[PDB]
């Protein structure tokens, strides 16, 4: 019988050592994020610079379009630029006044915010940094204008860098850097101006496509929920969540259960089942043992304003969810097979069936005390 605690927790050779980013990479992501923010604010200042000229005197739509064609907004399509000119020109004094006082704000969400960002494993997998852009508006400024300006910022940054690519997503604009295994998501929110924690009921997420242009979604709910869960459960929650995410990354090159569903399920389990934090191999064994049941009945979002769960119950499972249940069902067998191995190296080889050949030091495993 073996102990796998150091295998998990060692900050040099252990799984944690392989998953956590170095201060360098962390700073490279903060640098990329700062770049995106600076560009967004500059593009907004240029558009506001145009609109102030519109307010200061009647400017034909051609002139307004000539001014747009000289700003960073020139990195949009000709039709898109024309659209920006239209929306700026068709603004009534009121909306224009609310636009001239709009300075965008920024707040990061996701793994980079609550410290669960793993180093990617398989090719195609990249570091995900989600930096949300917030728009202090009353209650309103054009949804199309805002989306177009943030798109103009991102594309203006892509036009300055070899290897960068722009991708349009439903909830966000994205800048992809394949060569550096990195991508930055920029979701956009509308928030009450005067108020600007903050009343969730008014934090609206912008949608790119569909009949619905906005939907009430506050990321501070998930961030606070997970932080609270971390305080309540302990320091090991973040670790085992990192381990579960690494397992997901090792079993699927692309796809698998969402990180947030693994997080919610892991939290539920560590909230309802007794475990020992001084031994994360035992804890991981218990978690693996209880996860299939948690996913089978469905995983409800820690956000009650979500109509749909993070993972649906079994009677709705299709090929995808049945595949996820197959691997979730396969994990405990792997941890048990590794637990009862004949040698250190055999146990390593067996547990690396679950986390991949990332930990190579078999000396991190030890014989369990009596
Ligand atoms: N209320 C909800 N918010 C969500 C949901 N899915 C994602 N999000 C929000 O998007 C944020 C980031 O989403 P991601 O897909 O990148 C999950 P996360 O970054 O934590 O994991 P990794 O990026 O894979 O390391 C997350 O913190 C949430 O605030 C959801 O189903 N419900
Ligand atoms: Mg993220
Ligand atoms: Mg993302």
Swiss-Prot record:
Listed binding positions for GTP are: 109-114, 245, 259, 306
Co-factor binding details:
Binds 1 Mg(2+) ion per subunit.
The protein's induction, as recorded, is: Expression is repressed by the transcriptional regulator VspR. Part of a CBASS operon consisting of capV-dncV-cap2-cap3.
Q: Which GO terms describe its biological process?
A: cyclic nucleotide biosynthetic process; defense response to virus; negative regulation of chemotaxis
Entry's EC annotation: 2.7.7.-
Any phenotype upon disruption? Cells lacking this gene show a significant defects in intestinal colonization.
Q: What is this enzyme's catalytic activity, as reactions?
A: GTP + ATP = 3',3'-cGAMP + 2 diphosphate
Q: What is the effect of changing residue 106 to P?
A: Abolishes enzyme activity
Task: State where ATP binds.
Answer: 174, 217
Spell out the residue ranges making up region: Disordered: 297-316
**What is the protein's quaternary organization?**
Monomer. Interacts with Cap2 in the presence and absence of phage T2. A Cap2 dimer is bound on either side by a DncV monomer.
Function, as annotated: Cyclic nucleotide synthase (second messenger synthase) of a CBASS antivirus system. CBASS (cyclic oligonucleotide-based antiphage signaling system) provides immunity against bacteriophages. The CD-NTase protein (DncV, this protein) synthesizes cyclic nucleotides in response to infection; these serve as specific second messenger signals. The signals activate a diverse range of effectors, leading to bacterial cell death and thus abortive phage infection. A type II-A(GA) CBASS system. Catalyzes the synthesis of 3',3'-cyclic GMP-AMP (cGAMP), a second messenger in cell signal transduction, from GTP and ATP in response to phage infection. Also able to produce c-di-AMP and c-di-GMP from ATP and GTP, respectively; however, cGAMP is the dominant molecule produced by DncV in vivo, contrary to the 2'3'-cGAMP produced by eukaryotes. Is required for efficient V.cholerae intestinal colonization, and down-regulates the colonization-influencing process of chemotaxis. Is not active with dATP, TTP, UTP or CTP.
What is this protein's record name? Cyclic GMP-AMP synthase
Which organism's genome codes for this protein?
Vibrio cholerae serotype O1 (strain ATCC 39315 / El Tor Inaba N16961)
């Amino acid at each position: 019988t073996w102990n796998f605690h150091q295998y998990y927790t060692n900050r040099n050779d252990g799984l944690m050592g392989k998953l956590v980013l170095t201060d360098e990479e962390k700073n490279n992501l903060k640098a990329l994020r700062k770049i995106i923010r600076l560009r967004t604010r500059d593009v907004f200042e240029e558009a506001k610079g145009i609109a102030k000229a519109v307010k200061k005197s009647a400017l034909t739509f051609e002139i307004i379009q000539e001014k747009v064609s000289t700003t960073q907004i020139k990195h949009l399509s000709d039709s898109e630029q024309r659209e920006v000119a239209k929306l700026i020109y068709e603004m009534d004094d009121d909306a224009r006044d609310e636009f001239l006082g709009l300075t965008p704000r920024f707040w990061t969400q996701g793994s980079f915010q609550y410290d669960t960002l793993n180093r990617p494993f398989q090719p195609g997998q990249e570091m995900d940094i989600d930096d949300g852009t917030y728009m202090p508006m009353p209650i309103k400024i054009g949804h199309s204008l805002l989306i177009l300006l943030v798109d103009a910022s991102l594309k203006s940054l892509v036009a300055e860098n070899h290897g960068w690519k722009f991708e349009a997503k439903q909830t966000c604009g994205r800048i992809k850097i394949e060569a550096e295994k990195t991508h930055i998501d920029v979701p956009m929110y509308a928030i009450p101006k005067d108020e600007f924690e903050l009343d969730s009921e008014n934090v609206n997420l912008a949608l790119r496509e569909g009949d619905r242009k906005w939907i009430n979604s506050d990321p501070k709910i998930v961030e606070d929920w997970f932080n609270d869960s971390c305080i309540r459960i302990g320091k090991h929650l973040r670790k085992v969540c990192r381990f579960m995410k690494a397992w997901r990354d090792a079993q699927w090159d692309v796809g698998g259960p969402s990180s947030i569903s693994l997080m919610a399920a892991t939290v539920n389990i560590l909230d309802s089942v007794a475990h020992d934090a001084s031994d994360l191999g035992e804890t991981m064994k218990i978690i693996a043992k209880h996860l299939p049941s948690e996913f089978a009945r469905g995983v409800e979002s820690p956000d009650s304003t979500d109509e749909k769960p993070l993972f649906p119950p079994s009677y709705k499972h299709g090929p995808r969810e049945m595949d996820i249940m197959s691997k979730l069902e396969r994990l405990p067998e792997i941890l048990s097979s590794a637990e009862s191995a004949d040698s250190k190296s055999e146990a390593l080889k067996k547990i690396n069936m679950a986390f991949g050949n990332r930990v190579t030091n078999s000396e991190l495993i030890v014989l369990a005390k009596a």
